[PDB]
């Protein structure tokens, strides 16, 4: 036994089973699920654990990297750039289905052409977007960042998010991405109530997944772990209610951060994720 066999065992095996019944109901108390939170590793990586050169200014914070077996690895192919990092991880979806999300940290200024070139080669056609009142990486009206040209093609506000329709085109081809613009999220807070949250998860449900093969859904927050990790954490248990009426969001968290490490940042975040899947619970025929 290492630390580490320990941490992968822990994330590989815990689960907490709730029914609709016990998450509406009978939920395990506050204390419970404080406890319960603490006791979930982290599973960050040590620097010592990517041999990348020069990523740290690629980074907007030294402590939070991707986990590299999820990493997120940039293959130049419309570029003259240079190695192959950006601060991003593939994540499974419900019952561990690969690639449905690329979990993500907003764009630096020196990161925007990296991110974009992460857009066009996952064949991103969703972005969904977390902060409060981080940079605009989008243009307001047409832009190029490094070999693509963005344009936008619509901008709709929402009670609670903006949704703006872009285009990205390399070369001859250009695509449709949607990008959801979702705001009043402090990081290591909660959003105001769950209810803009669950009509959130719903305008992801709803967008039109035209491929043959979907690309991830790109999330991102500020550090690509908290807010990413609620968002995702919610919609993979709504999933798991709509299909099965139970969820292990203890199991999630855990699944999460395989993918990447400290997914979910805070206890109250956690409570938070138990108040919005209880809340789920009640739309359910």
Not at 113 to 120: A, G, I, N, Q, R
Not at 186 to 215: C, I, K, M, N, W
Not at 230 to 243: E, H, M, V
Request: glycine share 6%; aromatic share 8%.
């Amino acid at each position: 036994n290492t630390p580490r066999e320990v941490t992968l065992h822990f994330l590989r095996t815990a689960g907490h089973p709730l029914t609709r019944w016990a998450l509406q109901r009978q939920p395990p108390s506050p204390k419970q699920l404080e406890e319960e939170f603490l006791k979930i590793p982290s599973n960050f990586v040590s620097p010592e654990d990517l041999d990348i050169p020069g990523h740290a200014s690629k980074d907007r914070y030294k402590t939070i990297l991707p986990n590299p077996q999820s990493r997120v690895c940039l293959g130049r192919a419309q570029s003259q750039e240079d190695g192959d990092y950006i601060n991003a991880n593939y994540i499974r979806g419900y019952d561990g289905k690969e690639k449905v999300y690329i979990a993500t940290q907003g764009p630096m200024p020196n990161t925007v052409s990296d991110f974009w070139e992460m857009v066009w080669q996952e064949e991103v056609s969703l972005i969904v977007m977390l902060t409060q009142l981080c940079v605009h990486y989008w243009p307001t009206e047409e832009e190029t960042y490094g070999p693509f040209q963005i344009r936008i093609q619509d901008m709709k506000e929402c009670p609670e998010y903006t949704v703006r329709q872009l285009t990205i085109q390399y070369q001859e081809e250009r695509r449709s991405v949607k990008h959801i613009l979702f705001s009043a999220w402090p990081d290591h807070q909660t959003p105001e109530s769950a209810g803009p949250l669950l009509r959130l998860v719903a305008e992801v449900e709803e967008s039109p997944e035209t491929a043959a093969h979907p690309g991830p859904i790109v999330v991102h927050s500020s550090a690509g772990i908290g807010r990413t990790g609620c968002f995702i954490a919610t919609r993979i248990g709504c999933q798991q209610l709509k299909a099965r009426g139970e969820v292990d969001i203890l199991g999630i968290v855990c699944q999460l951060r395989l993918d990447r490490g400290g997914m979910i940042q805070t206890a109250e975040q956690y409570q938070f994720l138990h108040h919005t899947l209880a809340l789920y619970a009640g739309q359910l025929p």
